[PDB]
Subunit: 417 residues, 4 copies
């Protein structure tokens, strides 16, 4: 009925879940309304998320709303075993997630999740939805809709749409303003460095840190690396973010040129093989590589393993690969999302807004069942904006409002001298 | 045939125009192609722009393209008289612009510009287009299309559209990525502080600087104020930018609360009466107010003039208003765009991209004459992106490109474990 | 002969210790020379330090020099049990330090250390040196010199001197340029935020963080707090650093004013009761307080415990005090050094320079026995400067040198 | 008796001078007391300063104190002609300074100044003091004391001392905390970028800016360059500041390596020929070079003029040197202090503290006549500290003070 490491961890999990809730007031307000209105009565739901204290708070909100949920891990290394135990023991929510599970177990958990015959699927990376569409065409009648948490998953869903197989509504949670403006940027910025520091306790100041990608995540990682005293190099494939990085004070160059200069490399591109053997070959002795994109394939670790003569664990979450010429490359978190693998992921303050979008996106799918076209849907503007209003209020920040006279001016095109 | 301060200033103007061109290579490339292809042969054009060295380089590019142009000032205080002289004397381009001209002269220049019967109108603030639509309905057959440089003008054009009177194509230059991502942000950031410093030589470090608005301009002004050692307060009307400002490290509060704390106030909202008598009344003795939004109406200077018992000029571009209770309020640039009134406006590096958009937007209007719907048009993505590619190249910055294998991964929705 | 938690944790300690050595290249060379020259032959030593991977690497250097060393914890919560086990087990260095040891056990270890009859005492807070002066006047015959690692220890030594009881050479390690320009500033800046984040995983961006003190540590904490997106308030008692903080972009104000605004309070003053009952009473519901200065007494936790009707642990290293009106005050690390209590302390890069100073200051005391005047002695400038040169080289950074004509120009007027 | 450009510019000078006074509150109070006590009664004085609105406010303070003052320019390009006219016309203070005066005229003014037989000399670069020692040995009978405003002047005085010719009291104004912690750092940081921008209106964001020297000025310039979006490289000759720059996030390297990367070079070293012919030869086409340290000799412009086949003025304060291969080198301010040559120098806020030091250092020299030992004397700590207190108060910032028990805790060990 579940598959977890150790249910005796539930008390620790409960404590950390309650602490996380302190900065998730928006989701708390949503949970209390769900508790009354039960939008998910009779709905079966699968969530493929990072099994964290923040995901637990989302699961509790969906549970209050009546959802018959089943949670599986989005990544083998991000699972928090105490959280899994608490969800099973305290809430009776089936969880199939073991920190460190092998790929066979991960894939079996996806099969178990699809056997739940979900009506709603919350995905983080689109693994489950892709598996649904590829292997479970006979189940598609169950689907009211799905949601997608992260940028990599949105890219996959776009490919599904262009391939003609996205035959149901999918909510683009990642691209909501109150999601990727804060989660992807400020959350990833802090928690990526957190993971690197918990793994290595390395001094960031004075180090050359290479950030691959200058999108929402790259901007955050570079900003916080800079804030911690690092010399920051940015790599890119598109000129607009490249000019931005330069005018933000960072050096921009091709990865081949960055490869011999970086002390720490951090990939946040969403793309495959951004760091390759031709790069490993020129890296400093002891260069550190890690990834905060969704999938570890941003770094060609398979080639690194094949080239290296020895690999050994030298600290928690930290492996030293020794190359035939004696130089070493350090890898954190086995190349998996370093903030979640070596630390705890984003602080709950930003996950409050991301998972408020998840909850209200699920509600949107059910309230509009039978009225949404197949394909990708953006979060409604009014929902996006109300999440922002509520979060600003809960942060204790007050701002101004337009007067009628100011509205009159906006609408009066004739005036201006 | 023109109306300028002093044509003997042309040699100084020529020198400053040539210097500005050094960081406008993208526009230079466009000018050389226009010189060959003459896209504006037989076209009459009016430009209502800030009469700066950067605008002169745009005017020279349009002139090379065959445009029969006429230039008027977008603001009485932004005109550079040496630039006006050089355009008339060296290029024979009619200019109607005198730094410090009164409102009657400004309005007469708009009338002269409309009497040119332009086919294309480049506007900065939409004064000329609004006057065209309100007073010159009988001329609309001349119009191939117009362009708009700034955010205030886009807002006016939206009101014209909603009012049913935008009956021709208008290119939204401001909202091109290569325009407001750099011009509005990094350009305004540097040149606003430049104007304040040229006006007052005040030490920015240790001062509390209140930035009204956290859009593209507000982000830039806050970023550079912070970079110069100021304590930064941000005011807003919308929660998304408000949360952003907080997570960027700034204090966010209503203007009423900021009013008693700020040493320098900078308005960049695009809206009317953001600083009002109720704010003046609680400001520190010697508080400085200035505006970098397009129109000075962001500050209620009319009420300040009526309240004050004395006003006197205390330094270039700097007025001291003494209130009946003896406290003083300092105003820079008479509330007109402070970067252009008290300094030289944006550096040419960013105007290279803004005015490349202007030139290519004008070309777009002519090449597509008879095929564009009335209403607002965005800059085509391929044009926007090519400007970015060329600017990055001219900045000497190299970046990466996706491999076929990386493209295959983007398109393969099934893979990911 | 040792008092540790679990000797079976030694492999993990050695793992983390060698990892830490990777960015201790300067101390490596000093230890390499020590094993060749054995400065500390027949010299017994006590170290009262934080029991960390970096302190271990220092102890390994003194051992390499022939030192007969004994290590005790400087703070019951900073001790790393795997490091204590590795030292006892892989090097034969007696360690008396157990993470979370009570007050009795702490001073029982200080009594064991002085029963070692140390010739050299390395101190971090002036705790053992102050006990030696107080209770072991008969043992002063054995002291060649002592060293002090922290600002608070330097302040107490100055009072010992002014009191007329600093009757031996004391090396001011903290005030060496290569120590507190970097350790106190860059080290404390990063590792203090590290401790807060490991304790709470709180988002720092958008929070108001109040930093009490703008000395070396305060500058570092404020700089990194700001770098992580916080609105930073600085409190002070001296005008020069107060003006600096304002010109660095921070809001300077009295603590009574900061108390109603701060989301997180960090004390780095070296002084007693900087956060007081009258501040708790006006703090925001859920305000976090922690200390990175000395001991814990920077926060008046005794008064907080009296104002509060309930206290509970709510996360690792994190206590929630609930006041009668229902508002809470969060305390991290029981008011002890938050970087060492909730995390691992400074990265080894900065401790490389701090502990190279320690190792050479110990070398100085020994090589100048019976030649040192009583009182405090600063690190020699050449030593301080050589550490910087070695570190800069180890970091792979090259700089310029004056040409003969540039020298000739400095001399003419 | 005066040598200025145009006495009719005086109203504009007085306008700008009083504006500058608004953020010179500390100097205001000192001048207020001076007019009451007249410390400089019967005392003749020379000032060799930059002829700015802030220097004017200093001269007005010495005049208020009874000073018989004469002012000459410290740099032919820093002189503000309207300020010179206002001083002559509104206060009767002889000024010998003309913006853009040639070399002959400069030293003709230095000869006029010493013919004033000054009892006090305020110097900015040690120019007049070095001429007094060289040529006016007979006038040393008149010297009560002198003062020096800049690091370069301090270095030359040290050589005068070591040479055995500093036979009078010299006040080290530059090294007072309230002077170079702020003026040299925050003042130079802003006003150097101000000069570059007024000269060129170049976008600083996205440029690589090379800062030669990481002392007080270099830290300030690098900090603000970075704040304005530049990629900052720092060069150095000393390891301690080099490590600081790296830990502050800047790229540290030899100038030979920086020369091929920099878009803008800023020298703040105090030393000769820091940018040399072998650097010009590898610079990017259009690289900008300027100096904010001393004199101009930090950049080897003599060699540049020889490498170049042509030079032309291309904007105010801006020259383009074109080399035989067609590449250009841009020089701002003819290599003179770019903040003062192309802009207005430091804002008066920082000069408030620098010139309060000057005014009180002059008070010190006079009130201790015949009591000062020959050589350099630092600003008394109480004076330095009182300036900070007054400034902090004037800025509207309040801070804390220790309670009696907190004091009692500092003293116990
Ligand atoms: N670890 C976390 O907690 C977390 C949180 C949010 C998102 N993410 C992941 O981070 C990744 C990036 O997300 P985002 O929102 O920043 O995406 P984004 O689309 O906003 O930006 C990605 C950027 O990377 C650039 N890029 C692409 N390929 C590149 C290459 N080969 N080299 C250099 N730059 C390249 C793109 O041009 C773009 O600017 C995704 O995989 C996303 O799922 C992780
Ligand atoms: N001076 C320059 O050289 C220059 C350059 C570009 C744009 N501009 C002008 O700057 C202004 C702002 O442009 P932008 O591109 O940043 O626009 P924007 O739409 O990106 O942002 C404006 C911001 O102001 C906020 N705002 C609106 N009314 C407000 C109020 N009453 N109080 C506080 N915040 C308020 C909005 O919520 C928004 O976030 C416009 O007038 C534009 O034309 C000036
Ligand atoms: N946690 C760590 O790892 C670590 C490392 C090094 C030092 N420290 C400790 O941190 C403390 C500070 O060290 P430092 O080097 O910054 O000292 P410092 O002497 O350089 O600076 C202390 C500053 O605090 C100010 N101050 C004193 N009392 C104050 C009060 N009541 N309110 C506000 N400001 C006050 C002083 O004016 C001074 O500017 C010391 O106890 C030192 O031992 C901790
Ligand atoms: N422009 C202004 O308004 C202004 C104001 C104050 C001081 N200054 C001048 O600026 C200069 C620097 O003053 P400061 O207070 O920063 O001095 P400082 O002594 O504090 O720092 C100078 C730094 O330059 C470094 N240095 C010396 N020679 C070098 C070289 N060849 N290459 C690289 N680095 C080198 C030194 O190691 C030192 O760290 C002096 O000439 C001073 O008079 C100018
Ligand atoms: N603390 C966390 N809890 C749950 N999901 C997280 C956490 N941190 C990051 N994520 C999510 O994981 C996604 C990447 O797989 C990001 O889009 C982000 O929303
Ligand atoms: N240097 C300049 N030359 C011409 N136009 C400018 C300059 N600086 C700012 N502007 C423009 O003025 C507009 C505001 O009226 C901005 O959108 C910007 O594009
Ligand atoms: N990782 C660490 N190992 C040992 N001592 C440390 C560590 N981090 C900080 N310290 C020291 O602890 C002292 C504070 O008590 C500081 O002087 C500092 O040098
Ligand atoms: N505005 C100014 N007025 C007078 N002196 C100045 C000004 N700006 C900088 N200086 C001084 O010039 C010296 C550099 O020669 C510095 O010591 C600094 O104090
Ligand atoms: Cl709700
Ligand atoms: Cl082209
Ligand atoms: Cl050695
Ligand atoms: Cl006084
Ligand atoms: Rb995990
Ligand atoms: Rb292998
Ligand atoms: Rb309007
Ligand atoms: Rb102008
Ligand atoms: Rb009036
Ligand atoms: Rb894929
Ligand atoms: Rb610990
Ligand atoms: Rb000299
Ligand atoms: Rb000047
Ligand atoms: Rb004490």
């Amino acid at each position: 009925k579940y598959d977890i490491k150790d249910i005796s961890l539930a008390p620790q999990g409960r404590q950390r879940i309650e602490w996380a809730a302190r900065e998730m007031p928006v989701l708390k307000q949503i949970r209390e309304r769900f508790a009354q209105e039960k939008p998910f009565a009779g709905i079966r739901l699968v969530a493929c998320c990072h099994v964290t204290t923040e995901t637990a708070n989302l699961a509790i909100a969906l549970h209050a709303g009546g959802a018959d949920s089943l949670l599986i891990a989005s990544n083998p290394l991000s699972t928090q075993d105490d959280v899994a135990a608490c969800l099973v023991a305290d809430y009776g929510i089936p969880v199939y997630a073991i920190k460190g599970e092998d790929n066979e177990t991960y894939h079996r958990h996806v099969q178990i999740a699809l056997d739940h015959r979900p009506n709603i699927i919350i995905d983080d990376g689109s693994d489950v939805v892709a598996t649904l569409v590829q292997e479970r065409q006979h189940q598609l009648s169950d689907i009211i809709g799905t949601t997608e948490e992260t940028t990599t998953g949105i890219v996959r869903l776009r490919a599904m749409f262009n391939d003609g197989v996205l035959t149901f509504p999918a909510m683009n949670v990642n691209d909501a303003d109150t999601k990727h403006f804060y989660d992807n940027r400020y959350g990833t910025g802090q928690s990526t460095l957190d993971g690197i520091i918990r793994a290595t306790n390395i001094l960031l100041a004075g180090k050359t840190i290479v950030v691959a990608g200058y999108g929402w995540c790259g901007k955050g990682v570079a900003m916080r690396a800079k804030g911690m005293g690092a010399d920051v190099i940015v790599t890119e494939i598109s000129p607009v973010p490249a000019i931005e990085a330069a005018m933000d004070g960072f050096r921009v160059m091709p990865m081949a040129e960055a490869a011999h200069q970086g002390d720490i490399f951090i990939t946040v591109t969403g793309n495959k093989h951004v760091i390759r053997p031709e790069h490993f070959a020129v890296m400093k002795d002891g260069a550190i590589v890690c990834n905060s994109g969704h999938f570890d394939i941003e770094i060609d670790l398979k080639s690194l393993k094949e080239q290296a003569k020895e690999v050994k664990e030298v600290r928690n979450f930290t492996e030293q690969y020794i190359l035939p010429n004696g130089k070493s490359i350090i890898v954190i978190g086995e190349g998996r999302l370093v903030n979640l693998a070596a630390a705890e992921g984003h602080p709950s303050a930003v996950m409050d807004m991301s998972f408020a979008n998840q909850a209200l996106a699920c509600e949107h799918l059910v309230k509009n069942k039978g009225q949404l076209e197949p394909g990708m849907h953006s979060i409604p503007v009014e929902v996006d904006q109300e999440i922002a209003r509520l979060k600003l209020q809960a942060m204790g920040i007050a701002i101004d409002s337009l007067t009628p006279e100011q509205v009159e001016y906006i609408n009066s095109w004739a005036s201006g001298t």
